[PDB]
Amino acid sequence: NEYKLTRPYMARCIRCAVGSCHSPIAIEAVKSDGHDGYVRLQTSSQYGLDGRTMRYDMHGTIKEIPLHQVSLYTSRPCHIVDGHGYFLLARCPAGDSITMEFKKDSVRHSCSVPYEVKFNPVGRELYTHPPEHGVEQACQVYAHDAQNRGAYVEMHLPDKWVYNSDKLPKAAGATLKGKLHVPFLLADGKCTVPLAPEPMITFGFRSVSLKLHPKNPTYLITRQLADEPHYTHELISEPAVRNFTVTEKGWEFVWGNHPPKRFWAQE
Amino acid sequence: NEYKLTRPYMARCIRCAVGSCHSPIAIEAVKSDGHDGYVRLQTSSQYGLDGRTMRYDMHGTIKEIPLHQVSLYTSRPCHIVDGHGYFLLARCPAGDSITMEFKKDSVRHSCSVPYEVKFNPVGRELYTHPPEHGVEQACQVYAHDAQNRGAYVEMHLPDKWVYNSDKLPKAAGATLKGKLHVPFLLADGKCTVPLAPEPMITFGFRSVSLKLHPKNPTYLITRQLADEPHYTHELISEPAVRNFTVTEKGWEFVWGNHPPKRFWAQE
Amino acid sequence: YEHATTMPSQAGISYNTIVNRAGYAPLPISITPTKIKLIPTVNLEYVTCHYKTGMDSPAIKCCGSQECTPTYRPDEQCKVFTGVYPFMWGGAYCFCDTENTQVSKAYVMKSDDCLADHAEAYKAHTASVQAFLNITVGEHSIVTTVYVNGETPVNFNGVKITAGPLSTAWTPFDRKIVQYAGEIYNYDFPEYGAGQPGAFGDIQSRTVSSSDLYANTNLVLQRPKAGAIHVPYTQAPSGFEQWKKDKAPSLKFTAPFGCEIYTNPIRAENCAVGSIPLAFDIPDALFTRVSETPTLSAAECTLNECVYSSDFGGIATVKYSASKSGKCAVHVPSGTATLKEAAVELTEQGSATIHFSTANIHPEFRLQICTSYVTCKGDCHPPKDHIVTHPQYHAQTFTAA
Amino acid sequence: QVQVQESGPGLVKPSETLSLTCAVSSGSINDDSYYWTWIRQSPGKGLEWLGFIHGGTGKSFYNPSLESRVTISKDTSRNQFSLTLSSVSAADTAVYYCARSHFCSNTFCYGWFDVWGPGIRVTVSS
Amino acid sequence: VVMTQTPLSLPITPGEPASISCRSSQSLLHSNGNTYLHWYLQKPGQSPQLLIYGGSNRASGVPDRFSGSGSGTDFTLKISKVEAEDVGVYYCVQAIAFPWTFGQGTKVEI
């Protein structure tokens, strides 16, 4: 077990709301490589049960705030989904920083860190906020299991265990080291990706004409079903008219997350 | 009546501060197609007088918060202006979402929705936040009057009335319908638009030289006053030096929100 | 009896041929490929994923003098710094101005998510072509899977069928393949130990659960700044991210001959290319002679309505006076047409309709019923929709006019 | 395959908010197609259903008799599963179990529950 | 909703079939063509395992020594050849309308 066995530390942050400090909410690690805006943080606090709260360290005395008074933001605010151990899971948009802050009965405490939270949309309609309804595809999202899937991080005794951080030195008594699981792993699933409007398809002699009116930047992929593919791959944000030549062999057409359609001429 | 007969409802929002669920503060509609940042919202919660409050639906029971605890944000925070019925009027800047949220005793409620709020500046100096001072052009902004102008939306009994929503189904007993008015229609008025700096105008033999030093993106619109106009539209942000030829037939130009100035050459 | 026919490798389409012996009755063979696969021999080379810059802690000594213990982590850097943790009110709670000593150590391990966010590099060769057929050789119905290497037969009720080889020897799958999220890419991935930073191969484990990884990430330990204890490092961006945000589209969106690429069982299904040969060995039992079939009947064909479309446009009408009211095979020995069915059912003294396809403005195709050579001739009106979604059901010789 | 255990106290004092829990040992609570149930057995009454909830899209379903005083909840962070029973009585002395349901690809999962835990006795006594 | 199980007990000596009945208040057939019935086997000292659902559908890890059928409201569980390990209780079980009420329990022993 973690919350009944370990202890959080203080550590260096650039911006502790007045220059630097030794911060109770230091950010050691940020991961934003999954698809739909889930970020994972590795803080210098803990998140336990006594029913989901935050235990932090401040000049020896170990403190406690609820998790609802915590607030983190990148360029807009975020929404904490969960916390477990030193780690935390949220729903954050893109920004050139992650910031975190809370308020005891006096001036607020905060920490910011430059890590590029990156929104990584799913599919072939590049979006910025995920869609109400749509088709469903594979998505690797920072899951909500705090169970041991195989990842680990190291830690050590200095009475209680503490993470083996770059912002703290190493004792010389004995390296009584140990390993604790990294929750909030990146797992598969099914996410709801948008569906662009129906393309308008005007025929002609060995010719297709494509009137396209996208709601969002949608990729278009066209090729041929012949020995020479001629693959055209373009991102489209404005309304467009794209004409293509379609032999007796074939011509494949893929607009966003729609399925592939095929066309071939006849005399 | 006015109104004392309606009821709010729960409904699907994508995001509710933990994934998806039914939300009291859903957003059925957003309209952001006015000039100076006004947006109108249409939610699953009401706004009234018993003073400006928010009566929301929650698991059968009916609740009430004020309208200083509510908070909506798109990319920067908004500032509510008024509320009436299921509708809400605000001053929001540009973003790719509308989030809305509040907090009873311990829980925070939220609803976010992808809608393209857009700031549509008046005039020919494309600004992002309006100026302290400037000339006065004609604008259409979602007004603050909540009188009955002619716009109506539908609703029905299933004891109390409820909106004819896509996120609620229809009863089979009796379709007892009715219509209620939308306030805050888009009405005319007069708005304050920035005035660019004075263009510098050096002369030359049958020529004019414009030195331009803008504070923000601005339209330069030039034409000749002859049978062949040669209209030159440009957006200008950098400090520029544009030289134009000017005949006896005439030449006029327009720099941002300034009036049109007519220059005429001679020998 | 033996027969050596050729089938265009094109799924969804039927192939109605016949075996006609000089004395005995015909046999219709309707074979329809439902799927046609193309499976390369994949040999693993390495895997890759994001990296995680592990940072062993500072080893600090106040008025000290340290030495680096050589460890063998992947891309194990190590240094010693002098001066950087000056006095008290200088972070390390050391007493001294200089001769305070830090030892920094930074290694490069694979991500905590490398089990389910990782690309697999592959070397391909030796396509083991393969197929699914829907077969009717003499009033039967089989859904057999078939290899079209010409040594692996199938057997139904005395027949022996053997398919292939020489399906044009083509593959889309280039020598170097990368697999990621079900998508397959023809990238020139570098070998295990030639991967450079900022490229696909900055982290190279031989398997996803090996014991050794190779890390060339361009890491350079830097000097800290007083104020607090820390370990700095300049490191390159991962090449996984950079390949990801700059890769071309997949082989399913750049493949010729209309191939559909698929998953871990790497395969290109439905490549409309080449022609698979089929060699038969039919027995004499299911090969019956005339005495139980109708016969020559003074038949006459007419082409009522012909359109030279890609599909079954034409209708032929044969007027006969036959002995028995039963079944007959039907076929056109030439490529001047392609018929929907192989089995017509003659009544006693009636007529019969035949839906067919063709591509000539003046068809004259030697149509066949049980033993006869009836001859349909006519003209063909042009078509009504010059883009369709139903592919070609004919041969397209230089026989317009 | 999916072991299940149950926990919570025993002699809860009468007229109080009783509570129990139940863990999912080596299994998924956040999955669809499985719903999780609570079932009691009183001496001489026979078995009895209380309520359940789905894993994904977890909105609850109760018994209208004691819907006024029953509550089922969940915590994905611990993969646990719970029950809170207000305003207890005398006859409620019972053995409480928690149960999983079969992969509900059909309408037979209704009632068709499977791998259990041992049980927790509850004697509302003094 | 109410459901009666008959008999309260069933003495037997092995080597024989058997039959037990259940009468449900409302017709437990549904418009979608399904007879919602479950039969739980409770051994001594364990939680209820199953033998026969759907009115006539066997379970997966079940022996073939059982069967069941019925109509609307009158349902029958039939055993083919009783063994020693069949000692316990049988529960008739209902699911088409809340509450998911269960049976009173027929005790089986040799």
Q: Where are the beta strands (DSSP E) in C169-274?
A: 176-180, 183-185, 203-205, 213-215, 220-221, 233-234, 260-261, 268-269
> Which long-range CB contacts under 8 A does B19-24 form with residues at least 24 apart?
B19/A81, B23/B109, B23/B110, B23/B111, B24/B56, B24/B57, B24/B58, B24/B63, B24/B109
| Total H helices, total E strands in chain E | 0, 12
By CA distance, what is A146's nearest residue in D? D77
CA distance A12 to B136: 53
Resolution, rounded to a tenth of an Å?
3.6
Interface with chain A: mutation pick from B12, B27, B97, highest number of A CBs within 10 Å = B97
Q: What are the distances in angstroms from CA B235 to CA A85, B121, B134, B218, B220?
A: 54, 14, 20, 5, 6
A214-233 residues touching C, CB cutoff 8 A: 221, 223-229, 231, 233
CA distance B164 to B114: 22
CA distance A98 to A31: 11
DSSP secondary structure string for all residues of B167-226: TS---SS---EEEEE--S-EE--EEEE--PPPPEEEEETTEEEEEE--SS-EEEEEEESS
Question: CB–CB of E50 and D49 under 8 A?
Answer: no
Q: From the CA of D28, how many Å to the nearest CA of chain A?
A: 9
Q: Indicate the helix (H) or strand (E) that contains C242.
A: helix C239-244
The domains found in chain D, sorted by start residue, are: 4-122 (2.60.40.10)
CA distance A96 to A30: 12
In the 3-class helix/strand/coil scheme, how is D46-105 assigned residue by residue? EEEEEEEEECCCCCEECCCCCCCCEECCEECCCCEEEEEECCCCCCCCEEEEEEEECCCC
CA distance B158 to B172: 9
For chain D, helix, strand, coil in percent to 5 are 0, 45, 55
Residue in C136, C132, C142 with CA at minimum distance from that of residue C163? C132
A47 neighbors A85 (Cβ within 8 angstroms): yes
Across the interface, of D46, D49, D112, the residue whose CB is closest to E104 is D46
A12 neighbors C224 (Cβ within 8 angstroms): no
A107-146 residues touching B, CB cutoff 8 A: 127-132
Q: From the CA of B117, how many Å to the nearest CA of chain A?
A: 13
CA distance B70 to B92: 14
Look at phi and psi of residue A36 and say left if phi exceeds 0, alpha if psi is from -120 to 50, else beta.
alpha
Look at residue C47 and give its three-state secondary structure: strand
Instruction: Judge if the upstream peptide bond of residue C232 is cis by omega within 30 degrees of 0.
Output: no
Chain A touched by D76 (CB under 8 Å): yes
CA distance D74 to D21: 9
Around Cβ B234, how many Cβ atoms within 10 Å? 12
Chain C touched by A188 (CB under 8 Å): yes
Look at residue C290 and give its three-state secondary structure: helix
Chain A touched by B30 (CB under 8 Å): no
E24 neighbors E73 (Cβ within 8 angstroms): yes
Q: What are the distances in angstroms from CA C98 to CA B48, C64, C68, C90, C94?
A: 71, 9, 19, 12, 10
Chains A and C touch (3+ CB pairs under 8 A): yes
By CA distance, what is C172's nearest residue in A? A227
How far apart are the two ends of chain E, measured CA to CA in Å?
A: 33
Chain D touched by A90 (CB under 8 Å): no
Residue in A262, A225, A267 with CA at minimum distance from that of residue C394? A267
Query: For tokens 């265990």, what's the residue?
Result: A161
Name the CATH code of domain E3-108 (choices 2.60.40.10, 3.20.20.80, 3.20.20.70, 3.30.300.100): 2.60.40.10
Across the interface, of C57, C249, C392, the residue whose CB is closest to A221 is C249
Residue in B13, B113, B23, B76 with CA at minimum distance from that of residue A77? B76
Query: For tokens 């208040």, what's the residue?
Result: E25
Query: DSSP assignment, residue D30?
Result: S
Residue in C61, C116, C67 with CA at minimum distance from that of residue C83? C61
Q: What are the distances in angstroms from CA E73 to CA B69, E20, E26, E30, E68?
A: 57, 14, 7, 11, 13
Contact partners of E by the rule of 3+ C-beta pairs under 8 A? D
- Find chain D residues with C-beta within 8 A of A51's C-beta: 75
Look at residue C234 and give its three-state secondary structure: strand
Could you tell me the sign of the dihedral formed by the alpha carbons of B153, B157, B159, B162, in that order?
Answer: negative
Dihedral pair phi/psi, residue C304, rounded to 5°: -70, -55
Q: Where are the beta strands (DSSP E) in A67-108?
A: 71-73, 79-91, 98-102
Question: CB–CB of C117 and A33 under 8 A?
Answer: yes
By CA distance, what is E49's nearest residue in D? D114
Dihedral pair phi/psi, residue C134, rounded to 5°: -120, 110
Interface with chain A: mutation pick from B21, B96, B101, highest number of A CBs within 10 Å = B96
Q: What are the distances in angstroms from CA B179 to CA B11, B186, C238?
A: 21, 20, 59
Angle at CA of residue C132, ends C126 and C138, nearest 5°: 130
Q: From the CA of D98, how many Å to the nearest CA of chain E?
A: 10
Q: Where are the beta strands (DSSP E) in E1-110?
A: 3-6, 9-11, 18-24, 29-30, 34-35, 38-42, 49-53, 57-58, 66-71, 74-79, 88-93, 106-109
Angle at CA of residue B235, ends B234 and B237, nearest 5°: 135
Dihedral pair phi/psi, residue C241, rounded to 5°: -55, -40
Across the interface, of E34, E95, E105, the residue whose CB is closest to D111 is E95
Residue in C39, C35, C37, C31 with CA at minimum distance from that of residue C15? C31
Q: Where are the beta strands (DSSP E) in C349-399?
A: 351-357, 364-368, 373-377, 387-388
Give me the half-sphere count of Cα atoms (radius 13 Å) on the Cβ side of residue C153. Answer: 11
DSSP secondary structure string for all residues of B107-156: PEEEEEE---------SSB--SS--SS-EEEE--EE-S--S--S-EEEEE
Neighbouring residues of C310: CB distance < 8 A, sequence distance ≥ 6: A248, A264, A266, C357, C388, C390, C391, C392, C393, C394
Question: CB–CB of C256 and A229 under 8 A?
Answer: yes
Question: CB–CB of D111 and E93 under 8 A?
Answer: yes
CA C6 to chain centre: 22
Look at residue C211 and give its three-state secondary structure: coil
Burial of A176 (0-12, 13-18, 19+ CB in 10 A): exposed
R_g (Cα) of chain E, nearest Å: 13
B246 neighbors B208 (Cβ within 8 angstroms): yes
B187 neighbors B165 (Cβ within 8 angstroms): no
Q: From the CA of E101, how many Å to the nearest CA of chain D?
A: 7
Look at residue C353 and give its three-state secondary structure: strand
Give me the half-sphere count of Cα atoms (radius 13 Å) on the Cβ side of residue C400. Answer: 4
Q: What are the distances in angstroms from CA C333 to CA B77, C30, C343?
A: 78, 15, 15
Q: From the CA of A78, how many Å to the nearest CA of chain B?
A: 9
Dihedral pair phi/psi, residue A156, rounded to 5°: -165, 160
Query: DSSP assignment, residue C336?
Result: S
- Find chain B residues with C-beta within 8 A of A68's C-beta: 106-108
Q: What are the distances in angstroms from CA C257 to CA A120, B133, C272?
A: 32, 66, 5
Instruction: Judge if the upstream peptide bond of residue C165 is cis by omega within 30 degrees of 0.
Output: yes
* Bridge partner residues of C363 (DSSP): none
Q: What are the distances in angstroms from CA C370 to CA A245, C15, C28, C317, C350?
A: 44, 18, 10, 16, 15
Residue in B2, B43, B12 with CA at minimum distance from that of residue B169? B12
CA distance C17 to A194: 47
CA distance C54 to C56: 6
Look at residue B73 and give its three-state secondary structure: strand
Q: What are the distances in angstroms from CA D126 to CA A227, A256, D11, D16, D89?
A: 86, 68, 7, 13, 13
Query: For tokens 């057929």, what's the residue?
Result: C133
D47-66 residues touching E, CB cutoff 8 A: 47-49, 61, 63-65
By CA distance, what is D29's nearest residue in A? A145
Which pairing describes strands C183-185 and C176-180: parallel, antiparallel, or unpaired?
antiparallel
Look at residue C291 and give its three-state secondary structure: helix
CB pairs under 8 A between D and E: 49
B181 neighbors B152 (Cβ within 8 angstroms): yes
Query: DSSP assignment, residue A167?
Result: T
C206-235 residues touching A, CB cutoff 8 A: 227-231
- Find chain B residues with C-beta within 8 A of A94's C-beta: none
Q: What single-letter amino acid sits at C195?
A: G
Structure tokens at B91: 């001053």
Which pairing describes strands E9-11 and E106-109: parallel, antiparallel, or unpaired?
parallel
Question: CB–CB of E47 and D97 under 8 A?
Answer: yes
